[PDB]
């Protein structure tokens, strides 16, 4: 009884977790194909995405 | 470089350097070598870094 | 045995001035005999005693349709080359700006889809002709039909990037 | 040492005489079974955009300018077996009856006969660039026939419990390529019923899920503790 | 978004995200100005929680193993 | 058990010679040093041929039936191999340095450029038995005056077009009757003619030279006698042509220069299709696919291998190996990939099946000395000579942690916790052990007490006690955790290099400089037993040294040892060309493997050919480097007393043969050895070697299929287990129905349990029957999963191979179907309107 109710609760929460993953990446992807930009050339495309990426700076040791 | 190679690389290392590294976010597919396969499809930035 | 290809009176003067580079592959590479009727505004291709008449007909029919000289010579050679014609038909709203959507500013969308799909396209008022291989014509036509039927520019440009890569890829 | 000899007795089950056992294609029709092929084909299909973006050189190569435009088509006479060197065989839709591709013609004929076995055989046959280029061009505009024919072809496919990781990635490639038009004309009757019966067969796939959940959990418990 | 960064207060965030997603128009939600710097912030946190809860379901099968031992007991 | 065979050679995708493709160009054949590797690029796998040339190989060709290969080394010892059976057919010594060998397009002849003679032999059959002399000579033509650099057959196997160092090129008909069609020679080049090709129709002839001119020759009139109609020039000024090839069907000329730059042209019009660079080293090999879509380039200095499709401008693979410079290896916690720490300063993660490198990591500015996995394949630690230990996430590919000391020392070995809180590292100049926390970054402790350089470190995997061992002839056991700070020093007879630790943490095996492997009980610090190994070590004689291999003290000891995962065996290697494995209960040599027979490496031969020893020095210490055709290898930039620095040009001696690290596979019955030639992978396979387990006269394959046809499934399964025949076990295993998997799996006897588990592992990695294999795994784990838990180390490599199947194919499939379920629920449950 514990096994059935516990696994039902856990699959019930990861159902909406997976729903929200696919829905939110659909929302982001349809915004992207609505108005991201126009590059057909792969080199200019990859340089555009490298200039528009998220940067974070880290303190390394040499 | 040639002093280390001449010394047969028993040397004493460089002292210290707290440098500064910028990493952009990208798929770790793209951070790999050119081969048919892959090893991990994560993104190089953590959720707490995004 | 002969063929007649009617030259319309908007592609007549380029045919006459580039005629001297049109008839030599028609009369010595292809061994046809060729006449240009100035009365009916037509091109007649007859066979001498000494399956290439359809090749010459497609050569001058490509030039008639609106493709340039080197493009028509590319159709005359290069056995794996085809050319598909269609009107829009899918007026201010629909006819007067779907063709502006195929063109874009300075024809850059047409140039992009030409380079991406490795075809080349001549866009009339509403008459689209596409010269390419079979799969290339398929993809250029699917993208042209897409942006007359309504698709985002991001969607059609991402599909153009992808189709360029996957058409040049082995496996 | 160079061939294999039969261990069949002289005097004065051919696989068991030649010490082999060619593993049979699927053991039972109620058993899931992957493709007979490389395991990496699923991953190549699912991420072939980012893999090729990795594989590009770091700067553009130096070409010429007086290069012929139809260079891919201007070969001579070891023959190319790609989707680009495909000829049509033998009155205006996206693909006429003289300019139908093999995939679209077989998809239409399977929609007539309600048996997409030849379609799925062609899908399991050709290469990942060809698979992406066939799924990405599927007439998603006015009546939505080719999408729904592909969807109930995948339904007939994964009813048969074979090649099912490939049928799963073909559905993922469909939802990725033009799942936005399926979301657009959601509540359309034909496409909603095709997705309905696809989910009707696909909802019996959690057998694999709780089977690998049991094996992972109990294997971890037995190994560590 | 900033409730989803916990692993505790994340279920409330997921239910609210789910009802927004299933009660609003998706084209509207995309074209609202500012709704990509939020959903890109909270896709990877939902993926982190999916991995964690899926591993909880994975290690929930010791109950099933203990039950098959308890049935082998006779 | 002990019946290992040479499986694979990871690392070193290219050394020297020509790349070849298959006919259906799916595999590419790459000359690694004296082996040949074959990489199947579609079915993602790879193998290396077992046979071995005695010098570095220089030419490769296999006929377009795919049925036999011929490989020639750098003094003409050809070897003809059956390509499908993988067994060598003939050894044929051509007497001098052969530049090229080619089969005909119709397969029936091959020709080769031995010196300045073009000699055509005719190919023996693969169906015929081996004869004493299978090759029958067709002809040998001599018209060139200097050495021939290239061959090219025509499309019909009718003419052959050869290019020489002598500034001409010649055309020869195969048979005598067409001698008048092919008697011309093609002059006009200022330098070595590097290539000479036909067009598709065999009317034009293109001849490419070293200085950079390609000549188009046509049979025209100025009678008709092979004029030159157009000379095209590359105009690469400092660089010059190193390799040429031509695909005649697509009219594609591919040319690689000595500057890394390669250009590819559409030839009779000479239009540059593309121009791009491999690197800075010269392009030693260009090869082209049969359809002309793939180009494989090889550079020989860095050992790198591209195959590149020029239509879609993209690399199919861009790989690079490490010759002679590989300090450590570590298997992944499932035996799927090997991490290599190499002396040029980098980490490389090589897949084992597909023989290629997935990720590389260059953040150490000096030679990386040790790699070690932790947190079950999530994190990986490495220590180098630049003073740093540092940690690597193998998910996000980031060096997230860097540990230094306070004393500016260089680290030579490391050891991590099982519960990876603490990393630990030891140097060869500091006598301390440095103990860092991994969660914070700080230096947690410096353990002191050795009076000699700490040669080796290892944490016990179960009770987490640290064992260090050092050159003061002492192994030492540190209880670090929990209020002890306890030290137990065990003395030993000589100075220790390579400690190793049992999988249960009970015992520790140390290798000493005497030549022995001693095995100690940790808790009661007394010696359990030792192996005396210095008399089953193959120590070869170097060329430079003046003392015999018998009396040498260079390599009669093992610098790296490793336990098997059942704890019962030790594999061991050192600075010698033998790796030896033993079983530690009986302390007896199971098997000794000769890691190289290359005479181009140094310590291979025990006895050196006395012909090569002259009145002043040996003839192999004479440097013939100024007899070279160009300056970049006439150059000597080898600073004098350098041993184990970097950059093989800077050491002046032959590369000695040595194994620097040995490890057993955690999942499948194999070991990897980091030699100088690459990562040698030795593995058993159960397809061969009939080794039964208590069969009787009534136990027979016939009896097993009668019991299977009579459907006593458990009796058929145990008969196949007593046969121990892989095909029979597979046949019975697939013939048992789903209805009674758990009855059979509950009634399997306990002695046949590791056999069925390791069978299910090595079957289910590549088999398609995913639900069948998971049903069997579920039935076995449910029915007998208490015996496994109380006999952990028996099923320690059979259970790691099973969860190499669940998380690596089955969980990927389950991830895909889960994402499809959730995208369906979103795409039909929500609102798409406008």
Q: Does B47 touch chain F (CB under 8 A)?
A: no
Q: Rg (Cα) of chain D, in Å, rounded?
A: 23
Q: Which long-range contacts (CB under 8 A, 24 or more apart) does D104-113 make?
A: D104/D146, D107/D146, D107/D149, D107/D150, D107/D153, D108/D149, D110/D149, D110/D153, D111/D145, D111/D149
Q: Which long-range contacts (CB under 8 A, 24 or more apart) does F306-313 make?
A: F306/F278, F307/F28, F307/F41, F309/C168, F309/C169, F309/C170, F310/F252, F310/F264, F310/F273, F310/F274, F311/C168, F311/C169, F311/C170, F311/D72, F312/C165, F312/C168, F312/C169, F312/C170, F312/D52, F313/D56, F313/D57, F313/D60, F313/D61, F313/F274
The CA-based angle B29-B31-B32, given to 5 degrees, is: 75
Contact C169 F42 (CB under 8 A): no
Helix (H/G/I), strand (E/B), else coil: F408: coil
Cα–Cα distance measured from residue F59 to residue F53, given in angstroms and rounded to the nearest whole number: 12
DSSP states of F686-702: TTSS---SS--TT--HH
- Residue whose C-alpha is closest to residue F312's, from C143, C79, D133: D133
Chains near E, with 3+ CB pairs < 8 A?
A: A, B, D, F
DSSP states of F193-210: EEEEEE-SSTT-EEEEES
- Residue whose C-alpha is closest to residue C132's, from C149, C115, C112: C115
Q: Which of F43, F273, F294, F312 to mutate to test the interface with C (most CBs of C within 10 A)?
A: F312
CB distance F573 to F595 below 8 Å:
yes
- Residue whose C-alpha is closest to residue F69's, from F84, F58, F54, F50: F84
CB distance F191 to F211 below 8 Å:
yes
Whether chain F lies against chain D with 3 or more Cβ pairs closer than 8 A is yes
Contact E59 D183 (CB under 8 A): no
Chain B residues in contact with A57 by the CB 8 A cut-off are: 20-23
CB distance C5 to C57 below 8 Å:
yes
- Residue whose C-alpha is closest to residue D198's, from F821, F735, F392, F661: F821
Helix (H/G/I), strand (E/B), else coil: E11: helix
Cα–Cα distance measured from residue B33 to residue B23, given in angstroms and rounded to the nearest whole number: 18
Cα–Cα distance measured from residue E34 to residue C151, given in angstroms and rounded to the nearest whole number: 23
CB distance F198 to F152 below 8 Å:
yes
Helices H, strands E: what count in chain E?
4, 0
Chain C residues in contact with D74 by the CB 8 A cut-off are: 77-78
Q: Name the B residues in 19-48 with CB < 8 Å from any D CB.
A: 27, 29-30, 32, 34, 36-38, 41
Q: Rg (Cα) of chain F, in Å, rounded?
A: 30
Kindly state the tokens that stand for F100. 């090229």
- Residue whose C-alpha is closest to residue F511's, from F459, F573, F451, F452: F573
Q: Name the F residues in 125-144 with CB < 8 Å from any D CB.
A: 126
CB distance F274 to D61 below 8 Å:
yes
Q: Does D214 touch chain C (CB under 8 A)?
A: no
Cα–Cα distance measured from residue D168 to residue D123, given in angstroms and rounded to the nearest whole number: 12
Neighbours of F584 (CB within 10 A): 21
Contact A60 B19 (CB under 8 A): yes
Report how far apart, in Å, the C-alpha atoms of F690 and of each of E24, F87, F721, F734, F750 are: 69, 20, 12, 21, 22
Backbone angles phi, psi at F286, to 5 degrees: -120, 140
F5-10 sheet: strands from edge to edge: F5-10, F679-683, F670-674, F662-664
Whether chain A lies against chain B with 3 or more Cβ pairs closer than 8 A is yes
- Residue whose C-alpha is closest to residue F25's, from D80, D35, B38: D80
- Spell out the SS3 assignment of D64-101: CCCCCCCCCCCCCCCCCCCCCCCCCCCCCCCCCCCCCC
Cα–Cα distance measured from residue F194 to residue F325, given in angstroms and rounded to the nearest whole number: 32
- Residue whose C-alpha is closest to residue F370's, from F355, F391, F393, F399: F391
DSSP 8-state code for residue F540: P
Cα–Cα distance measured from residue F370 to residue F374, given in angstroms and rounded to the nearest whole number: 13
Kindly state the tokens that stand for F711. 């459907």
Neighbours of D40 (CB within 10 A): 16
Nearest CA in chain A to D55: A42
Helices H, strands E: what count in chain D?
10, 0
Closest CB from E25, E65, E69 relative to F831: E25
CB distance F85 to D1 below 8 Å:
yes
Contact D217 E26 (CB under 8 A): no
Cα–Cα distance measured from residue F368 to residue F205, given in angstroms and rounded to the nearest whole number: 51
Tokens 């690694």 correspond to F32
What are the start-end ranges of the H helices in F478-597?
Answer: none
Backbone angles phi, psi at C73, to 5 degrees: -70, -35
Please, what sign has the CA dihedral across residues D194, D195, D196, D199?
Answer: positive
Backbone angles phi, psi at F526, to 5 degrees: -130, 150
Please list, in sequence order, all residues whose beta carbon lies within 8 angstroms of the beta carbon of residue C66, skipping any fewer than 6 positions away: C11, C122, C124, C129
Contact D63 F767 (CB under 8 A): no
Closest CB from B10, B12, B39 relative to F358: B39
- Residue whose C-alpha is closest to residue F196's, from F303, F102, F261: F102
DSSP 8-state code for residue B1: -
Chains near D, with 3+ CB pairs < 8 A?
A: A, B, C, E, F
- Spell out the SS3 assignment of F232-245: EECCCCCCCEEEEE
Q: Name the F residues in 731-750 with CB < 8 Å from any D CB.
A: 731, 734, 737-738
CA distance C96 to chain D (A): 20
Please, what sign has the CA dihedral across residues E17, E23, E24, E27?
Answer: positive
Helix (H/G/I), strand (E/B), else coil: D6: coil
Chain E residues in contact with A34 by the CB 8 A cut-off are: 30-31
Cα–Cα distance measured from residue F402 to residue A48, given in angstroms and rounded to the nearest whole number: 32
Kindly state the tokens that stand for F490. 């065990």
DSSP states of D189-223: HHHHHHHHHHHHHHGGGHHHHHHHHHHHHHHHHHH
Strands F486-491 and F474-479: antiparallel
Task: Tell me which H or E stretch contains B9.
Answer: none
End-to-end CA distance of chain A: 57
Cα–Cα distance measured from residue D215 to residue D204, given in angstroms and rounded to the nearest whole number: 19
Q: Does F787 touch chain E (CB under 8 A)?
A: no
Cα–Cα distance measured from residue F379 to residue D70, given in angstroms and rounded to the nearest whole number: 50
* Backbone torsion region of residue E9, taken as left when φ is above 0, otherwise alpha when ψ lies between -120 and 50, otherwise beta: alpha
On the CB side of D106, how many CA atoms lie within 13 Å of its CA? 14
Cα–Cα distance measured from residue F177 to residue F179, given in angstroms and rounded to the nearest whole number: 5
Backbone angles phi, psi at F121, to 5 degrees: -110, 165
Cα–Cα distance measured from residue F77 to residue F63, given in angstroms and rounded to the nearest whole number: 19
Kindly state the tokens that stand for D33. 């079974």
Kindly state the tokens that stand for F515. 């030549």
Task: Tell me which H or E stretch contains F479.
Answer: strand F474-479
Chain D residues in contact with B34 by the CB 8 A cut-off are: 54-55
Contact C154 A45 (CB under 8 A): no
Reported resolution in A? 3.2
CB distance F81 to F35 below 8 Å:
no
Contact D101 C138 (CB under 8 A): yes
- Find how far residue F500's CA is from the centre of its chain: 25
Neighbours of F408 (CB within 10 A): 13
Please list, in sequence order, all residues whose beta carbon lies within 8 angstroms of the beta carbon of residue C144, skipping any fewer than 6 positions away: C102, C113, C121, C128, C130
End-to-end CA distance of chain E: 53
Residues C47-77 as b or e (16 or more Cβ within 10 Å = b): eeeeeeeebbbbbbbbbbbbbeeebbbbbbe
Cα–Cα distance measured from residue C37 to residue C7, given in angstroms and rounded to the nearest whole number: 10
Rounding to the nearest 10 degrees, give the CA dihedral for residues F810, F811, F817, F820. -150
Report how far apart, in Å, the C-alpha atoms of D194 and of each of B5, D104, D152, D176 are: 70, 18, 6, 17
């Amino acid at each position: 009884r514990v096994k059935t109710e516990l696994r039902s609760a856990l699959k019930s929460t990861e159902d909406d977790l997976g729903f929200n993953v696919q829905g939110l990446k659909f929302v982001k992807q349809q915004w992207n194909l609505r108005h991201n930009y126009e590059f057909v050339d792969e080199y200019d495309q990859q340089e555009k995405e490298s200039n528009s990426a998220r940067k974070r700076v880290f303190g390394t040791v040499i | 470089y040639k002093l280390d190679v001449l010394s047969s690389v028993h040397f004493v290392p460089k002292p210290a350097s707290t440098s500064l590294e910028i990493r952009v976010e990208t798929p770790t597919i793209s951070m790999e070598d050119a081969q048919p396969l892959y090893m991990s499809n994560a993104s190089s930035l953590a959720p707490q870094e995004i | 045995e002969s063929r007649k290809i009617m030259v319309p009176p908007h592609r007549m003067t380029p045919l006459r001035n580039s005629w001297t580079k049109i008839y030599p592959p028609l009369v010595e590479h292809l061994k046809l005999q060729v006449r240009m009727n100035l009365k009916t505004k037509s091109v007649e291709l007859r066979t001498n005693p000494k399956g290439a008449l359809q090749k010459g007909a497609d050569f001058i029919k490509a030039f008639t349709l609106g493709f340039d000289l080197d493009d028509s010579i590319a159709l005359l050679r290069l056995d794996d080359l085809y050319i598909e014609t269609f009107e829009v038909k899918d007026t201010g709203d629909h006819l007067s700006r779907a063709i502006g959507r195929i063109a874009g500013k300075d024809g850059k969308t047409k140039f992009a889809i030409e380079n991406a799909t490795r075809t080349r396209i001549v866009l009339a008022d509403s008459k689209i002709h596409i010269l390419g291989g079979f799969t290339h014509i398929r993809m250029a036509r699917e993208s042209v039909v897409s942006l007359i039927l309504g698709s985002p520019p991001g969607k059609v440009y991402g599909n153009l990037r992808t189709v360029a890569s996957r058409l040049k890829e082995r496996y | 040492q160079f061939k294999t000899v039969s261990t069949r007795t002289i005097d004065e089950l051919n696989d068991i005489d030649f010490n082999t056992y060619t593993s049979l294609e699927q053991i039972d029709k109620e058993l899931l079974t992957l493709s007979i092929g490389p395991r990496s084909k699923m991953n190549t299909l699912l991420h072939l955009d980012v893999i090729r973006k990795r594989s590009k050189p770091k700067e553009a190569p130096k070409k010429s300018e007086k290069l012929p435009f139809f260079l891919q088509l201007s070969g001579e006479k070891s023959v190319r077996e790609g989707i680009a060197h495909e000829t049509p065989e033998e009155f205006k839709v996206t693909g006429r009856l003289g300019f139908e591709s093999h995939f679209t013609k077989q998809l239409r004929e399977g929609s007539q006969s309600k048996d997409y076995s030849s379609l799925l055989a062609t899908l399991i046959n050709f290469s990942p660039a060809a698979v992406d280029l066939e799924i990405r061009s599927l007439n998603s505009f006015e009546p939505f026939d080719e999408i729904v024919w592909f969807i109930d072809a995948l339904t007939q496919g994964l009813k048969s419990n074979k090649n099912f990781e490939l049928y799963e990635t073909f559905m993922s490639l469909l939802f990725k390529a033009h799942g936005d038009v399926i979301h657009a004309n959601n509540k359309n009757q034909d496409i909603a019923s095709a997705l309905q019966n696809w989910e009707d067969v696909h909802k019996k796939e959690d057998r694999l899920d709780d089977l690998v959940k049991f094996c992972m959990g109990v294997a971890a418990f037995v190994t560590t503790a | 978004r900033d409730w989803n960064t916990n692993a505790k207060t994340h279920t409330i965030a997921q239910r609210t995200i789910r009802c927004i997603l299933m009660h609003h128009n998706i084209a509207k939600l995309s074209e609202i100005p500012g709704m990509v710097k939020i959903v890109d912030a909270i896709i990877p946190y939902t993926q982190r929680h999916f991995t964690r809860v899926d591993n909880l379901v994975e290690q929930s099968y010791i109950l099933d193993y203990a039950l098959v031992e308890m049935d082998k007991l006779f | 058990k002990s019946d290992f065979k040479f499986s694979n050679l990871l690392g070193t995708v290219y050394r020297q010679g020509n790349i070849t493709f298959s006919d259906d160009g799916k595999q590419l054949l790459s000359p690694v040093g004296n082996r040949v590797s074959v990489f199947d690029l579609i079915n993602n796998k790879s193998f290396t041929f077992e046979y071995e040339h005695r010098k570095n190989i220089a030419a490769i060709d296999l006929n377009k039936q795919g049925t036999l290969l011929i490989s020639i080394d750098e003094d003409g010892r050809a070897i003809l191999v059956n390509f499908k059976a993988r067994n060598v057919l003939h050894h044929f010594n051509f007497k001098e340095k052969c530049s090229a060998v080619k089969f005909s397009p119709d397969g029936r002849l091959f020709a080769l450029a031995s010196g300045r003679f073009l000699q055509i032999w005719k190919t023996p059959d693969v169906n015929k038995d081996r004869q004493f002399a299978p090759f029958v000579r067709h002809r040998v033509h001599a018209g060139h005056f200097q050495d021939i650099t290239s061959l090219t057959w025509s499309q019909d196997s009718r003419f052959i077009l050869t290019t020489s160092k002598d500034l001409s090129a010649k055309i020869w008909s195969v048979d005598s009757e067409e001698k008048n069609l092919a008697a011309t020679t093609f002059n006009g080049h200022r330098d070595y003619v590097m290539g000479a090709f036909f067009s598709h129709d065999q009317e034009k002839i293109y001849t490419v030279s070293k200085d950079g001119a390609v000549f188009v020759w046509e049979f025209t009139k100025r009678k008709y006698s092979w004029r030159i109609t157009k000379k095209h020039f590359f105009y690469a000024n400092q660089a010059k042509v190193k390799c040429v090839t031509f695909h005649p069907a697509t009219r594609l000329l591919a040319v690689g220069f000595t500057s890394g730059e390669f250009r590819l042209y559409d030839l009779p019009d000479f239009t540059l299709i593309q121009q791009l660079s491999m690197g800075q080293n010269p392009v030693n090999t260009v090869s082209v696919n049969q359809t002309g879509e793939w180009l494989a380039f090889g550079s020989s200095k860095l050992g790198q291998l591209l195959v590149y499709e020029w239509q879609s401008e993209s690399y199919i693979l861009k790989q690079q190996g490490h010759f002679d410079s590989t300090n450590s290896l570590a298997y992944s916690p499932d035996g799927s990939r090997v991490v290599t720490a190499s002396e040029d300063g980098k980490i490389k993660v090589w897949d084992i099946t597909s023989g290629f490198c997935l990720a590389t990591f260059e953040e150490h500015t000096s030679s990386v000395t040790a790699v070690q996995f932790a947190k079950r394949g999530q994190v990986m630690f490495s220590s180098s000579l630049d003073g740093t230990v540092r940690a690597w996430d193998l998910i996000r590919y980031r060096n997230f942690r860097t540990f230094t000391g306070t004393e500016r020392i260089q680290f030579n070995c490391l050891a991590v916790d099982p519960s990876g809180e603490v990393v630990c590292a030891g140097s060869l100049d500091n006598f301390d052990i440095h103990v860092w926390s991994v969660q914070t970054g700080q230096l947690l402790d410096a353990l002191s007490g050795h009076e000699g350089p700490v040669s080796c470190l290892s944490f016990s995997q179960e009770n987490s006690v640290l064992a260090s061992a050092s050159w003061d002839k002492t192994i030492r056991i540190w209880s670090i955790f929990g209020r002890s700070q306890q030290v137990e020093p065990i003395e030993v007879y000589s100075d220790v290099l390579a400690l190793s630790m049992r999988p249960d943490g009970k015992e520790v095996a140390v290798s000493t400089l005497k030549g022995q492997i001693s095995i100690f009980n940790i808790e009661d610090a007394k010696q359990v037993g030792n192996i005396d190994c210095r008399k089953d070590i193959i120590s070869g004689r170097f060329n430079q040294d003046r003392f015999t291999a018998k009396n040498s003290e260079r390599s009669k000891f093992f610098t790296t040892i490793h336990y098997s995962f059942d704890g019962m065996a030790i594999v061991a290697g050192g600075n010698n060309n033998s790796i030896c494995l033993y079983d530690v209960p009986n302390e007896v040599l199971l098997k000794r493997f000769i890691v190289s027979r290359n005479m181009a490496l140094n310590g291979t031969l025990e006895f050196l050919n006395s012909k090569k020893m002259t009145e002043a020095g040996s003839l192999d210490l004479i440097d013939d480097a100024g007899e070279n055709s160009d300056l970049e290898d006439r150059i000597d930039n080898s600073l004098p007393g350098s041993q184990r620095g970097g950059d093989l040009s800077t050491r002046k001696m032959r590369p000695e043969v040595r194994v620097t690290s040995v490890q057993f596979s955690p999942t499948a019955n194999a070991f990897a050895a980091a030699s100088t030639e690459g990562l040698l992978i030795y593995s058993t396979n159960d397809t061969i070697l009939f080794d039964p387990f208590d069969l009787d006269v009534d136990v027979t394959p016939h009896s097993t299929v009668e019991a299977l046809r009579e459907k006593q499934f458990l009796n058929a399964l145990v008969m196949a287990f007593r046969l121990n025949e892989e095909y029979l076990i597979n046949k019975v295993y697939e013939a048992i129905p789903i209805k009674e998997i758990p009855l059979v799996a509950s009634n399997i006897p306990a002695i046949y349990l590791p056999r069925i588990l390791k069978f299910i592992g090595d079957f289910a990695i590549e088999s398609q029957h995913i639900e069948f294999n998971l049903i069997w795994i579920k039935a076995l784990l449910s029915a007998s999963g208490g015996y496994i838990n109380e006999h952990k180390y028996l099923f320690s490599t059979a259970m790691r191979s099973i969860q190499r199947f669940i998380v690596r194919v089955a969980k990927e499939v389950v991830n895909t179907t889960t994402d499809n379920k959730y995208t369906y629920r979103f795409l039909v449950s929500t609102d798409g309107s406008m």
